[PDB]
Every structure is written in C-alpha cells, then in structure tokens.
Amino acid sequence: MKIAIINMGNNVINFKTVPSSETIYLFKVISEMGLNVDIISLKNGVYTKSFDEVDVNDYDRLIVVNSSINFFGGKPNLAILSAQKFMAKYKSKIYYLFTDIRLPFSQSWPNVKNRPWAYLYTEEELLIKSPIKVISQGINLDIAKAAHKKVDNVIEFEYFPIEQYKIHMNDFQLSKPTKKTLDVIYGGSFRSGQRESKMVEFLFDTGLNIEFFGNAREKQFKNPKYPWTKAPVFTGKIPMNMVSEKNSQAIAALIIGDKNYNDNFITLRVWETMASDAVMLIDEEFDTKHRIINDARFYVNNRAELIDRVNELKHSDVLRKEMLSIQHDILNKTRAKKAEWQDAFKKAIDL
Numbered sequence: 001m002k003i004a005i006i007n008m009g010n011n012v013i014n015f016k017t018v019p020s021s022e023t024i025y026l027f028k029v030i031s032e033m034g035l036n037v038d039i040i041s042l043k044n045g046v047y048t049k050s051f052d053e054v055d056v057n058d059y060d061r062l063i064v065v066n067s068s069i070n071f072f073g074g075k076p077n078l079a080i081l082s083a084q085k086f087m088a089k090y091k092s093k094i095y096y097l098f099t100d101i102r103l104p105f106s107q108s109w110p111n112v113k114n115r116p117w118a119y120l121y122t123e124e125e126l127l128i129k130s131p132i133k134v135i136s137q138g139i140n141l142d143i144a145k146a147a148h149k150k151v152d153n154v155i156e157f158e159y160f161p162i163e164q165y166k167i168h169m170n171d172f173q174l175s176k177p178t179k180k181t182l183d184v185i186y187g188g189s190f191r192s193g194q195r196e197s198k199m200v201e202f203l204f205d206t207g208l209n210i211e212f213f214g215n216a217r218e219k220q221f222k223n224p225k226y227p228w229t230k231a232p233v234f235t236g237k238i239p240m241n242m243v244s245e246k247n248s249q250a251i252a253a254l255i256i257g258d259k260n261y262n263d264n265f266i267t268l269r270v271w272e273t274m275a276s277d278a279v280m281l282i283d284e285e286f287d288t289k290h291r292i293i294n295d296a297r298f299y300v301n302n303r304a305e306l307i308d309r310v311n312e313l314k315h316s317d318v319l320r321k322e323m324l325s326i327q328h329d330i331l332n333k334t335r336a337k338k339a340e341w342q343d344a345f346k347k348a349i350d351l
C-alpha cells in the first residue's frame with residue numbers, strides 16, 4: 001500500500017503558507033496512522049518528492065487537497081498545471097479533500113484553452129477523466145453536491161471531519177496560560193469578501209482591543225452594505241504552526257464562517273481556538289444546535305452580545321478560567337476518539 005497526496009494548486013515546501021502547511025499536516029497525520037505516504041509537489045524537498053521524479057501509477061491511492069485553479073495575471077501557474085497533469089495520468093479513483101466551500105474540484109482545461117499560452121498544453125494532458133470521490137468536511141453534504149454540479153466524474157460524496165487533524169497530531173498539546181494583551185482576536189484571510197458582513201459585525205466598532213491577523217488587510221473592507229468607523233488592528237500573517245500561540249494572546253477568540261459553513265462545517269479554527277488559552281466565542285448562526293459545545297455561554301448572536309460577553313470575561317478571571325476548563329475538557333473528549341477517527345479516514349479512502 002502506497003499513498004500519494006498532492007495540493008491541486010499550491011506549491012508545498014514549508015509552513016510559511018497556509019496551503020503548504022495544511023498539506024504537510026495531512027501528510028503527517030496520515031503517516032502517523034500507519035501508512036506509507038509521499039507528498040508530490042514541484043520539487044524535491046524536506047517533505048516532498050517531485051512530480052517529474054515519480055510515476056503516479058506507483059501509488060495505490062491518490063489524495064488531492066482542494067485548491068483554486070484560477071490563473072491570476074498572465075502566466076502559467078505550474079502548481080496548478082503540474083498537479084492536474086499528474087491527476088490526468090492516474091488510472092484509479094481520486095480522493096478530493098473538500099475543506100473549503102469555495103474550492104470545489106474542477107477542470108483547468110476550460111480556462112487554459114483560452115489563454116495566450118494554451119499552445120503549451122493539450123487537452124489530453126490536462127483533462128482529468130478518473131472517477132472522483134469528494135470527501136467533504138460538511139456533514140450535510142448538500143453544499144458539496146451543489147458545488148460539484150458542473151462535474152460528471154464525481155460519482156461519490158462522503159463526510160469526514162478532516163480538519164480534526166489539528167488535535168490528533170502526535171505532537172499536539174493544549175495551550176498554557178498566557179499573558180493577555182488583547183480582548184478579542186481572529187486570524188484568517190479576506191476570503192474574497194465572502195465573510196465581510198460577519199467580520200465587520202464582530203470585529204469592527206466594538207470599543208474593545210481587537211486584532212485581526214492573517215492575509216486580510218483593512219483596505220479590503222469597503223463594501224457599502226457593511227460600513228464601519230473603527231477597524232481592528234491588522235498585524236499580518238504568521239505560520240500555521242504558530243496560530244494557537246497567537247490566539248492565546250487574547251481573552252477571547254472568534255469563530256465565524258461563510259454562510260454555507262453554518263450547521264455543516266466544523267472548521268480547523270474551531271480546534272485551533274478551542275485548544276488555545278483564549279475563550280472560544282462562536283457566532284450563534286454558525287452552530288445553531290450547539291454541536292461544538294453544549295454551553296450557551298460560548299455563543300454570541302451579534303456585536304452587542306460579543307461586547308457584553310467579553311466584558312464579563314474581563315471582569316471575572318474565575319469565569320474566564322471556568323470556561324477555558326470546560327472547552328479544554330470538551331476538546332479532550334474528541335481526542336479520546338482518535339482511533340475511531342483514524343479508522344473512519346481509512347474507510348473514506350476505501351482502505
């Protein structure tokens with residue numbers, strides 16, 4: 001049994017970029033559950049083999065991490081092209097890890113054919129015909145199915161909480177008590193404005209000391225429908241393996257998601273936040289049935305409620321520590337099901 005994992009549209013090297021980091025974490029968690037796996041990327045490296053040094057058919061399973069296949073600017077993105085060429089040569093079923101609703105599987109050919117550099121690729125080299133099984137992080141599968149309507153080879157849809165890998169890593173540990181320097185914190189990208197309303201609601205004009213880390217920038221928030229006066233402090237990106245430490249600098253950390261994540265996706269940030277020294281505060285709309293934690297104190301409906309909840313936490317260190325103790329206990333209950341999680345993953349990739 002030999003497994004190959006690749007990122008469909010981003011180079012994989014180290015932990016400097018999110019797509020590279022997530023691919024390496026997945027490689028590591030799969031290796032830790034008893035499996036011979038290789039990451040195949042553009043070049044040979046600490047964690048990877050090169051597309052041109054291996055034969056895709058030497059592998060029995062091909063796992064693909066979702067990614068955008070948009071060609072920005074006027075140049076051939078080799079990370080996208082080489083990955084799809086690799087996929088096109090594979091004979092067996094391809095397992096597509098769907099962790100972001102904006103990144104469903106799709107063919108790059110339709111786009112490539114109309115580029116000025118189209119002469120560099122043939123339809124045969126890029127058109128992927130192998131059957132595809134979408135492994136969705138969404139438990140309802142409704143979004144995954146709708147997102148993959150324009151694809152015919154996708155013959156299967158199965159749910160699996162992929163991003164729980166954060167807590168199942170062999171080197172994982174809960175964050176320790178940290179000196180507080182912020183009231184509220186949130187880390188992430190602008191996500192092409194797909195979450196602007198929620199970001200403005202909970203992180204702007206709060207009167208609190210809030211930090212927004214990640215690729216997002218203040219100048220990106222300009223939608224007239226979601227006005228604001230005072231923005232949080234944007235500090236820039238940091239490595240994915242430093243996120244829990246960053247979250248721990250605040251009294252509370254926010255959990256929000258795209259509309260379609262609601263009552264469906266339990267994202268990586270849920271675990272990165274729950275494991276941190278910051279109290280996890282969740283937008284009620286994101287998890288209306290309170291599947292993450294059965295304690296309403298961890299949920300807020302709007303800006304006003306967030307402010308009040310944070311004020312309560314700043315006023316009582318006892319309450320803050322009580323809530324942290326509860327969320328850490330809940331996280332431990334899921335960690336206790338590691339073996340079941342691993343077996344479920346193996347079942348998902350037909351092992």
Ligand SMILES: O=c1ccn([C@@H]2O[C@H](COP(=O)(O)OP(=O)(O)O)[C@@H](O)[C@H]2O)c(=O)[nH]1
Nearest residue numbers: 018187188189213214237238239240268269
């Ligand atoms: O500076 C940063 C900010 C965020 N992240 C990662 O980016 C994820 C958030 O991704 P996104 O902004 O797409 O939000 P999601 O839709 O996953 O909530 C976090 O969970 C972190 O793992 C990171 O590595 N560095």
Ligand SMILES: [Mn+2]
Nearest residue numbers: 099100267268
């Ligand atoms: Mn995500």
